[PDB]
Amino acid sequence: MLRISQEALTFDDVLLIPGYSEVLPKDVSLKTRLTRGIELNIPLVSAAMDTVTEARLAIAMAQEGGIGIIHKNMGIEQQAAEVRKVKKHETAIVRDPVTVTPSTKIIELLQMAREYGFSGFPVVEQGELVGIVTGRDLRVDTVAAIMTPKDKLVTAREGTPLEEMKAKLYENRIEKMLVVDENFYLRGLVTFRDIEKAKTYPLASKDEQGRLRVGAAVGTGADTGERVAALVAAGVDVVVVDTAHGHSKGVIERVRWVKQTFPDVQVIGGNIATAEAAKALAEAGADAVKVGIGPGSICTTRIVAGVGVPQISAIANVAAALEGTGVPLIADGGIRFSGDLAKAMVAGAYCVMMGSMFAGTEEAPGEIELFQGRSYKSYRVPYKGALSAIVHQLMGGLRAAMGYTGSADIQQMRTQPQFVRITG
């Protein structure tokens, strides 16, 4: 009559068994799904923690091929403004160049040149590009009289490949070129030198319009309705309804409201740890579920409430419940090493959320502080350098595990390899 549901296993209870392998670790595919509608080139998402994910680290996550969830320990307007920073991050073209209008007085243009130099001011009339003003133009009353007019401009259409533009610069013997839309409205500016140095991120997570992807977290408190609406107006790709107990009337209804009110935004629900919670979130319309309740030993949930589910079994039970639905599941918590990340994938996660592991990187919030001959971030977290090096080690280990199991892609890794149970 002691109601024991099952024996539940954690990461240290299992090991992956090697299997026949034909694909080298460097050649396997890591592509996966965050939600019904969002694909990621690596199975990594950064946690909505105020020591982990603000705009800077979310941009870096998306560039690596995963995604960041911006934390909610801030005001509604600030959270939306963080989303905007990610959506607006552009790698090559310059979007807000300093312009003037035909009516601008040359006296005023010369004042702006004390800060900006003489490389050239675009001339705009209500967003229409009508010419450019160069220092050479000032060298041979309003800029309408001296500007180079529209029929001498060399421009590139918005959306032209960055390598087609470099070629047009060369053909025209120019270094700068203005970018316009179909109607000759100014849309930005590219430089030959800036295309050359333009670091590129071929794995970047991008939406259908080419902008970096980003998520944002919300609770179930009173202003959630207004926070979700601001995040959606900002272009957020995914809203994470994120509480300690996702299997609750509060979370289920908030997920339903988001899915009914903002049908075209992805919604994740959690956290959960059972098949039946997974089903309740799927039926409320969740586009993905986040798995993890007291996943680690000695941890407030276990010590204070005696509640928790070992994370291997929690992941496997959720994956079993969702097989066929099309709803991914994100493993949240208990990963301390890359080996644990590989086990979470074989147990059925579609990808993995990391938190404190990313805290203290250069891209995470906080300022670098020198303490007692050591580096910390303060707001005392040790300073960890660039996020790319951590991502590289994690994905390096996952690739290694896919080599040992003969898994050529994530779908195989999630469904084919086997564990052994060990004793310690």
Which residues ranging from 186 to 225 are in contact with its own copies (CB under 8 A)?
191-193, 196
Tell whether residue 287 is among the known ligand binding residues: no
Should residue 327 be labelled a site residue for its own copies when binding is judged by CB under 8 A?
A: no
Sign of CA dihedral 66, 71, 76, 82: negative
Terminal CA-to-CA distance of the chain, rounded, Å?
Answer: 30
Tell whether residue 254 is among the known ligand binding residues: no
Instruction: Determine the Cα–Cα distance for residues 169 and 172; give it in Å rounded to an integer.
Output: 5
Strands 128-133 and 14-16: unpaired
Which residues ranging from 233 to 252 are in contact with its own copies (CB under 8 A)?
245, 247-249
CB of 29 to its own copies, least distance (A): 17
CB of 133 to its own copies, least distance (A): 10
| 154 interacts with, out of its own copies, ligand F2K, none, CB within 5 to 8 A per kind | ligand F2K
- Amino acid identity, position 47: A
The DSSP string of 35-87 is SSS-EESSSEEE---TTT-SHHHHHHHHHHTSEEEE--SS-HHHHHHHHHHHH
Should residue 30 be labelled a site residue for its own copies when binding is judged by CB under 8 A?
A: no
Should residue 111 be labelled a site residue for its own copies when binding is judged by CB under 8 A?
A: no
Which residues, 6 or more positions from 251, have their beta carbon under 8 angstroms from its beta carbon?
220, 241, 243, 245, 269, 270, 281
By CB under 6 A, name the one of 43, 120, 269, 417 that touches ligand F2K.
Answer: 120
Tell me whether residue 113 or residue 153 sits nearer to ligand F2K (CB atom): 153
Nearest residue to ligand F2K on Cβ basis: 120
Distance of CA 116 to the CA centre of its chain: 33
- Amino acid identity, position 200: T
Binding mask 404-423 for its own copies (x = CB under 8 A): xx-----------xxxxxxx
Q: What is the DSSP letter of 96?
A: S
| 153 interacts with, out of ligand F2K, its own copies, none, CB within 5 to 8 A per kind | ligand F2K
**Catalytic residue selected from 24, 110, 174, 299:** 299
Which residues ranging from 70 to 109 are in contact with ligand F2K (CB under 6 A)?
none
351 is catalytic: no
Phi, psi of 279 (to 5 degrees): -65, -40
Q: What angle do CA 199, 203, 208 make, to 5 degrees?
A: 105
CB of 180 to its own copies, least distance (A): 20
Binding mask 292-311 for its own copies (x = CB under 8 A): -xx------xxxxxxxxxx-
Should residue 380 be labelled a site residue for its own copies when binding is judged by CB under 8 A?
A: no
Q: Which residues are catalytic?
A: 299
